[PDB]
Amino acid sequence: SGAIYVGNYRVVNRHLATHNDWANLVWEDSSRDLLVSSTTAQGCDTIARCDCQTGVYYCSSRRKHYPVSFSKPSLIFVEASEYYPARYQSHLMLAVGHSEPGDCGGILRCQHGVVGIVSTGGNGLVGFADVRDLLWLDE
Numbered sequence: 669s670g671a672i673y674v675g676n677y678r679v680v681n682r683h684l685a686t687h688n689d690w691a692n693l694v695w696e697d698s699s700r701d702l703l704v705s706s707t708t709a710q711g712c713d714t715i716a717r718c719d720c721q722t723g724v725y726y727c728s729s730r731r732k733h734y735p736v737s738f739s740k741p742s743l744i745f746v747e748a749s750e751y752y753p754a755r756y757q758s759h760l761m762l763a764v765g766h767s768e769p770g771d772c773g774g775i776l777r778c779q780h781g782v783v784g785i786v787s788t789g790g791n792g793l794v795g796f797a798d799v800r801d802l803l804w805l806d807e
């Protein structure tokens with residue numbers, strides 16, 4: 669679990685969105701596993717605007733942060749799950765690191781701010797949905 673709070677927006681994994689998220693929907697994309705909803709309280713996370721390939725992510729299954737090198741956002745095949753059929757997920761970045769299903773929502777940050785959130789994993793890999801291209805999160 670986990671979310672990003674920036675201005676009047678809440679960014680979460682689309683497969684973990686709640687009834688309130690869907691009732692206050694701003695935008696969602698199944699191909700990215702992202703959903704953004706509106707909030708009444710003000711958010712203070714800084715979204716990174718960069719091409720960093722190194723950062724730190726929070727891993728709930730270990731109660732620890734880990735430093736990682738990660739790939740550029742791209743289309744990566746993702747095996748079928750209870751939430752989606754087998755498909756290419758876009759804007760996804762991989763890194764060698766530990767992750768378990770409950771780790772989705774953990775934030776990945778670089779020196780510039782929030783880069784994305786955990787969205788996939790397994791086999792000693794962790795995948796992050798990128799948010800750095802969503803320029804509207806800040807305006």
Ligand SMILES: COc1c(C#N)cccc1CC(=O)N1CCC[C@H](C(N)=O)C1
Pocket residue numbers: 683701746749751752757767768769770771772787788789790791
């Ligand atoms: C495969 O299970 C893991 C593991 C592992 N091992 C480690 C981390 C996460 C998962 C779960 C995961 O990747 N899923 C299920 C929920 C939706 C995801 C998606 N974006 O399509 C795919």
Ligand SMILES: [Zn+2]
Pocket residue numbers: 716717718719720778779780781
């Ligand atoms: Zn950066």
